[PDB]
Amino acid sequence: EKPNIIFILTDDQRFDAIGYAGNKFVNTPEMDKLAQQGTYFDHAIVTTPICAASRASLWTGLHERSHNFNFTGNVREEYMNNAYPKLLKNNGYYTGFYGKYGVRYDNLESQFDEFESYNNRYKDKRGYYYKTINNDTVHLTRYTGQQAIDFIDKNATNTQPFMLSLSFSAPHAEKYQHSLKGYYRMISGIDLEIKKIRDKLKEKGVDKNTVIIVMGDNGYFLGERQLAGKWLMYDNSIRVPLIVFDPRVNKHQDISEMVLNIDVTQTIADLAGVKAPESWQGKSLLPLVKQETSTISRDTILIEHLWDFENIPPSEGVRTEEWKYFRYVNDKTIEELYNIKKDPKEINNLIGKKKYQNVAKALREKLDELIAKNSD
Numbered sequence: 361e362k363p364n365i366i367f368i369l370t371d372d373q374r375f376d377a378i379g380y381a382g383n384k385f386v387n388t389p390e391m392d393k394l395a396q397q398g399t400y401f402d403h404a405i406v407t408t409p410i411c412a413a414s415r416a417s418l419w420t421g422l423h424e425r426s427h428n429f430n431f432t433g434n435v436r437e438e439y440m441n442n443a444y445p446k447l448l449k450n451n452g453y454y455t456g457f458y459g460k461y462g463v464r465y466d467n468l469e470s471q472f473d474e475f476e477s478y479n480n481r482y483k484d485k486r487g488y489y490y491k492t493i494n495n496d497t498v499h500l501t502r503y504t505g506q507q508a509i510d511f512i513d514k515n516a517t518n519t520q521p522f523m524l525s526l527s528f529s530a531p532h533a534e535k536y537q538h539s540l541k542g543y544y545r546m547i548s549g550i551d552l553e554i555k556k557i558r559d560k561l562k563e564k565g566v567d568k569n570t571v572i573i574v575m576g577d578n579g580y581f582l583g584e585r586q587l588a589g590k591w592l593m594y595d596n597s598i599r600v601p602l603i604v605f606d607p608r609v610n611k612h613q614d615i616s617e618m619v620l621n622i623d624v625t626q627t628i629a630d631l632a633g634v635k636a637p638e639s640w641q642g643k644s645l646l647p648l649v650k651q652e653t654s655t656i657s658r659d660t661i662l663i664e665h666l667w668d669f670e671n672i673p674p675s676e677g678v679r680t681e682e683w684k685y686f687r688y689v690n691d692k693t694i695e696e697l698y699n700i701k702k703d704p705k706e707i708n709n710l711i712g713k714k715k716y717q718n719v720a721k722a723l724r725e726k727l728d729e730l731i732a733k734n735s736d
């Protein structure tokens with residue numbers, strides 16, 4: 361009646377960094393199986409390309425304009441409940457988390473083990489669980505992979521459905537020749553854990569009752585613009601691979617070519633039969649996966665932002681099915697506009713030019729008519 365849900369959350373996984381996207385050098389077969397088995401979202405976009413506000417936007421379901429993270433930094437003396445795990449926990453689920461929480465907030469409940477070492481610390485790392493703290497041996501990817509297995513086999517107890525949130529630290533650390541190789545390698549070892557997870561699901565016999573969701577936390581830069589990192593508002597930095605595979609409601613796939621990350625939070629609660637809080641600034645992706653109504657998402661224009669600190673710049677803009685816009689602020693206002701269907705590598709800025717300065721005014725307007733539509 362109610363499905364078990366598993367949200368795999370990869371750290372720094374580009375929308376390009378998956379075989380289903382044509383990448384011939386990754387080895388993500390179980391993910392590729394999930395995309396062909398479920399509905400893949402190629403134009404899945406992350407609102408704020410930072411591995412902490414995005415993760416917070418995942419929890420609280422509100423854009424960074426509305427939550428406003430911090431650095432590091434704890435947030436926000438329980439704003440935030442109004443939070444998709446804590447909601448299912450108090451409505452009818454046995455929630456569980458393993459990996460990087462990314463908010464530094466001192467509570468957490470049900471069953472967990474947050475890897476607080478410095479996220480990373482390669483092999484062996486500090487882990488904040490129940491009662492107190494205890495650090496453990498082998499390597500992040502395998503450790504949080506085995507913990508998910510244990511959570512399925514053991515006590516996620518068979519009465520109420522479980523919602524297991526998995527936050528992998530991989531692949532968080534030409535060009536660099538084969539450091540792009542090692543990046544791709546770290547995503548290949550997550551798939552081994554996906555084989556073991558869904559293999560564990562058949563022993564307990566719930567794989568036809570456990571919808572699995574996979575996402576990349578934010579974009580990346582691998583030599584584009586002679587740039588690394590993320591945080592800017594280019595497609596390779598905001599777009600991530602989001603797989604939503606439901607073994608119950610739709611046996612067969614359908615590829616969707618539309619938008620957005622803050623939707624998963626709604627896609628969790630709606631999935632769990634729980635009324636999604638009024639605060640959450642997303643929309644459910646359930647109509648898309650069971651091929652229901654609004655197969656054009658009806659989210660014609662979306663937002664994205666970066667409220668920033670150290671060196672350097674921030675940005676905020678909006679995107680459409682074939683139009684992009686964003687302007688920095690610290691320290692400047694370099695307005696930029698690109699056409700998405702003809703310039704996907706975003707090398708031709710189109711502002712100033714008279715034939716498209718009217719579509720810049722329509723997007724510059726809708727940006728203000730989207731920044732304040734979230735507010736607080």
Ligand SMILES: [Ca+2]
Pocket residue numbers: 370371372373410411532577578
């Ligand atoms: Ca990340």
